[PDB]
Amino acid sequence: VSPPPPIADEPLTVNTGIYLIECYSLDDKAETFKVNAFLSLSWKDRRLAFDPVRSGVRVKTYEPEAIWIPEIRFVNVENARDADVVDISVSPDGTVQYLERFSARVLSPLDARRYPFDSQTLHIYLIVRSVDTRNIVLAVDLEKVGKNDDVFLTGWDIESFTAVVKPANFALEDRLESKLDYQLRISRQYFSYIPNIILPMLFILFISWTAFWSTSYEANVTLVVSTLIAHIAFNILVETNLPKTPYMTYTGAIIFMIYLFYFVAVIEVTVQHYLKVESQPARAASITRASRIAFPVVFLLANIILAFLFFG
Amino acid sequence: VSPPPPIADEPLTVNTGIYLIECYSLDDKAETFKVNAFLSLSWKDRRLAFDPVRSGVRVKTYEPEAIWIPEIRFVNVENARDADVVDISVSPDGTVQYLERFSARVLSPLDARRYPFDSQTLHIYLIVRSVDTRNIVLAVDLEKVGKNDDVFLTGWDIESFTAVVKPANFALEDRLESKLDYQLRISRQYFSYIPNIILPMLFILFISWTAFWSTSYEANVTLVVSTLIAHIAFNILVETNLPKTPYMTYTGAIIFMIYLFYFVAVIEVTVQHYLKVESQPARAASITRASRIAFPVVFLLANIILAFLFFG
Amino acid sequence: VSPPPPIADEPLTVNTGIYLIECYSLDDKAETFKVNAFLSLSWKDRRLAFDPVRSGVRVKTYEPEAIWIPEIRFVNVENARDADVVDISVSPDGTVQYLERFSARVLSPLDARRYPFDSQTLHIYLIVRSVDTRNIVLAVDLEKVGKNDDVFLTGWDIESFTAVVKPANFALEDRLESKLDYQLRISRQYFSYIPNIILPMLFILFISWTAFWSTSYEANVTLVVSTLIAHIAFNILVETNLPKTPYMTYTGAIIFMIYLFYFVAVIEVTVQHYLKVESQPARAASITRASRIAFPVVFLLANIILAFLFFG
Amino acid sequence: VSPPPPIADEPLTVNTGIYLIECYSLDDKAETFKVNAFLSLSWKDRRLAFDPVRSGVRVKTYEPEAIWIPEIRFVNVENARDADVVDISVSPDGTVQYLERFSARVLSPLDARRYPFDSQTLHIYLIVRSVDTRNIVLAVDLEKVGKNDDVFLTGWDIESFTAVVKPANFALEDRLESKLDYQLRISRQYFSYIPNIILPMLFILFISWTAFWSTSYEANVTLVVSTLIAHIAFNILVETNLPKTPYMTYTGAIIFMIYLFYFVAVIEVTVQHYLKVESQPARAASITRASRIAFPVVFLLANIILAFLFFG
Amino acid sequence: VSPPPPIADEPLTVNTGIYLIECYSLDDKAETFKVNAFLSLSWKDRRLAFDPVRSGVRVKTYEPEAIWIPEIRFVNVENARDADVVDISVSPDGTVQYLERFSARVLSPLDARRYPFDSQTLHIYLIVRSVDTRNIVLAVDLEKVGKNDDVFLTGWDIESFTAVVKPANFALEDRLESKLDYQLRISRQYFSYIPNIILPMLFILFISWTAFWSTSYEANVTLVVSTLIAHIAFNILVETNLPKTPYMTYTGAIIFMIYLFYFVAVIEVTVQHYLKVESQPARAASITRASRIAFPVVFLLANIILAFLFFG
Ligand SMILES: [Cl-]
Ligand SMILES: [Cl-]
Ligand SMILES: [Cl-]
Ligand SMILES: [Cl-]
Ligand SMILES: [Cl-]
């Protein structure tokens, strides 16, 4: 009911540990994900010391009330966690073991500049606030940190779940606070992205490029404009997978380049027809023959430059 | 209020049983489903023994409090179950019967590689944690496991609801735990998928294939490109039924093959026109006559190979 | 606090009644709807008998606690009902009157084979579980069953709200249970469906049919394929009203027939052009003249047959 | 804890008042809106009379419990209101003043026949149920009814918030009930509807009408069918603003008329081409010259008639 | 449990302060956003005075109950805040320090007339209600107002978070109330808007403008109408980013201007063809040569005028 007084001036150390159980509902647009895990705490309080021989037992059990419990809170959460106590055990020396299961929704920013091949690090921050009588710090128990083998995120590969052992101590509202950081590393599964997104767009663009082997104005106009319409329709079809961010990504740059290429192809067709009308067929033939080689080479070079820029 | 002490060293056995009442909200993308069922527990505690003759009654009733109840928890759930106690009865020998009704949301992965003709097995995991004084194990009561005849899932056929009798015992956080597995088998109803998805796409492709009986460049270009646009529009229309997974499925492979066939048809039309312009009509006629037979046969062979690959 | 003991062996009868207040959120895809109504119960318990002359009052009032209340539960509900007690009154003879207001979400399957002109019957099931001391049955009070005149469902006409007087008694988990069924009959308002769905589709099909009065291959190809694209676009526009079921309905069959007709029209145009190219104009003229009559008559006959099949 | 007994037979009068604070989430399809306001009640109970001189105070304060409070409920609400008591004050004469803040979701039907220029009246119904000892009626306190100046609804203009002073008394379940009606009048802001919905559709139709100045069958077919496709696409684009009701509205009638006009234009183009093929150019020229004037005049006349029908 | 009586007539002053922690879920259409912050209160109550020497402690701690706490409420919130007390400390002089953490959903109107380059000011209103015994006012503690460095809003730049020091006092329901205003200033990140929205639309319009260099009626009709279809499709693709408001914005005006330009281009093409048919080629050549210059210059001038109108 009251914090344990220090011996002379020493602070109170609380050892923490989080065991991951389930993770779900990773929202890329809202930058949120849900968690469900165990929380373990351990501190020392000599007011609970007892003689095992006299009592006849080795470990005693206590109610969540009638016992002082440090106030641990999460920083980057939408609401307070929904938790229920599992076990509270005390040792003859006075060491208290605390265990509980909780659920929470976490806010963590994401960076999707390299959307198909990005890696992210989700953060969970644990903080404690000191009281007027005693100062409290936080520590990491490396044997209580882990994850279940059934943890899965759709479309992601879970790599590791560690914690930074060194806490961060700072003052807030004229009170000392200590903060710990838990990190979960994930990587995106980029397969099925090629045959579902990349290849059909390239097929439509290559179909549009066939206008360089024809001299009929009507057929070329139909081909190019209808392929533009088909490209827009495919973009509408696949927009649900593309990231929706206020900054430019790799795929968005590729799509913008495709739009620019469509515009340039329209210009080339118009120029060829106008030159043909003016009774100068040699210039038009030279221009279309040059374009036949120029377009794919420029496309490849621009793609290589963009890939080096984004991943270099 | 305290676990029942053992006679000498024997563990405490709890017999479990789940009677399914309702199932709803099966989300394929989120891999979740909701449940509503009865939970039955039965253990032995000799501290509650009584004489039926002296008491004048055969079965006694107790409040949920003032009685020790084992702590049973679900593993693959988003939040803790919402449950309410129904009946607690004790026998003169000391056997306690526990019954309750609960609702929960379960997380279970799904495999939709053969989307139209897939079968799934949903899992519900039941776990218990031992205490410092006594060790607790779990058992299955085969007469308390079943489902109501009104249980239904839209678009699925419910086949069976059984449980694995052998529990899994392991250590976690220096404590013994026992786990049971309940399995529900379902199969998808694949009718109305043909006339709503498969046939219109084949009709559009067959319409596109009519360009092999004509020698007009403008008409062929219009036919092929407009059929491509129609195919993309139909894909947009029916995307709500197709599975959205990070891996390739049967229908996705079929759709990709259709895209490739459209591209090849465009190439064939362009080649025929270019050969005709060069004053070589015999080669163009031979090529289009060959394509007339080549396209459907190759389509059929590729479909057969794909079907053998996915279902073999 | 305890069930009322019987005189010798008679069971306890509970008279029930539901007065509908509001209904809302009818989901066709999820087969759910929300309700808000009054629940009325009435049984007999002689332990509460009193003398009106001695007490000076005719009707006494009791708290929800300190009084035995039968446990009534709904079967086809997602969660337990959210209810609050309104009045508890006792008669000198010992008859107890119970009233409460509750809200719940009900699961009831729907059949939409005749989507525009279907009628449905929503079911609410009420059950009670017997105790070890006394057996309880259910009865219907016909004067406590009704609905408010302000009850409305968007797009539906409410016809009646009755209850089956005969309960169903069966054993479950070695315990007797009694079940009552409440039925609400509704019919769909099919107006505004014609001018918003049926007529534009027929207009597009009739526009496509104009190709039988022309001999230009390019114009016919453009007409038919562009009308196919327009049909797909209109289907995308109006898909939000069409039912999404795993079985075939009337409108879906009509749409599939329209797709088949488009395919056949494409085939006819191709055949006419090919015959014209082969320098056989008489056969092509005969074929197109025959098609001019054949197409609408076959459409009408097929529609009549389909209507007889679905509504016969 | 008990209702105040009457002097001889008079009923108990409760004066009510609602002060609007916020309104939000007006759903046209679901016919629902959310509210947040103050509730004020005032009745007379002589059991609380006290002498201000002896007590030394003028106004006393009471807890929500240990005091009889009339049970006020809302009729057209999805669930029970979420309310918290603010102040309870009593006068030496015995008059009690009650104040609370609540939030609720209201169900109120809407009529959108004249969608762009419609006005609605939202209703909130307040009811009370009499007890066996005393009968209770409701009254309106005109000085406690009002709204905050910051109340706003997106796309609507708030006009007034009054209440019908006369209550409605009727019997339900053999008990007397009194009902009050609170009305909120709103009107829709119809600007930005013209340049975002009306004008582009008219532009597309006028573009389609240019086919009457040309004699080329291919160009006319392309123009009309492509404009039909564009009209359907624009309808898909703007469907999110159009009302979704089971009855016909003004805008829906306009759209249906536009569809009919497209069909008639197709028929005219076909007739002109067929007459031209039959070597009768004078008839075709006369028909197209007549159509040039006939189409816009008929469109204007039909629009005027429709406007008079809907708003007359 | 009772408000502190004044010395003679002075009011009670409460010093407030809000420290922002997290902000998320900014809905432009619903004009709502979620918050999570600390609330700090400080007042004076001499009934809690104590001697530090006699007590042996400097700061005492109290439970949230058994102590009078002023009732602070938010005005523009959907529901009551979800808060939990953190610390309650008292000074020997009697000054009480109050701290709590809360979460809430705020309603604040937004103005998006200059959608790409708009700035907004979100408001949070704090109010208190006086009691019959004592009058309470509000004050701002400038050292308790701030925000965390990790506060982020997707697509926005956070600039400042201040408060108006002067409260607003007014009477409501015959009671005095004091209101404080907290303001958060944000600005929108307008990058990636150009290459994702503006440039493709201009490319499509420029493609449509190429019809002024050709004299073929069929090609011009195809170009213009197909570009109109592509523009509508792109609008459908990008509608998710455009604001949905009942008033006109900058981007909406630009889009309407583009529609008008498409209509005028159609008219020009029709006029040119009709003049050519009438055997007057010089007039048609002059008109198209004039249009070649007229269209882009008028577009630029109109854009400049619109930009000056909206941002001037
Ligand atoms: Cl927390
Ligand atoms: Cl659980
Ligand atoms: Cl229930
Ligand atoms: Cl209520
Ligand atoms: Cl609040």
Author numbering:
A (entry chain A), B (entry chain B), C (entry chain C), D (entry chain D), E (entry chain E): 5 to 316
Q: What does the paper behind this entry write?
A:
The GLIC-F116A was reconstituted into nanodiscs at pH 2.5, a condition that stabilizes wild-type (WT) channels in an open conformation. The 3D classifications focused on a single subunit confirmed that all subunits exhibit i conformation. The structure shows an ECD conformation resembling the o5 state with RMSDCα of 0.28 Å, while the TMD closely aligns with the previously resolved resting state with RMSDCα of 0.39 Å. In the GLIC-F116A mutant, although the β1–β2 loop shows downward displacement, due to the absence of bulky side chain of F116 supported by a clear alanine density, the Pro-loop shows only subtle outward displacement, leaving the conformation of M2–M3 loop unaffected. This indicates that the bulky side chain of F116 is required for the outward displacement of the M2–M3 loop. Therefore, this structure highlights the critical role of F116 in transmitting ECD rearrangements to the TMD. Our results show that the ECD of the GLIC-F116A mutant adopts an open-like conformation, while the TMD remains in a resting-like state, indicating the channel is arrested in a preopen intermediate conformation.
Gloeobacter violaceus proton-gated ion channel (GLIC), a prokaryotic model of pLGICs, is particularly well-suited to stabilize preactive states under suboptimal activating conditions modulated by pH. The GLIC homomer consists of five subunits, each with an ECD and TMD. GLIC is activated by the protonation of a series of titratable residues in the ECD, leading to counterclockwise rotation and contraction of the ECD.
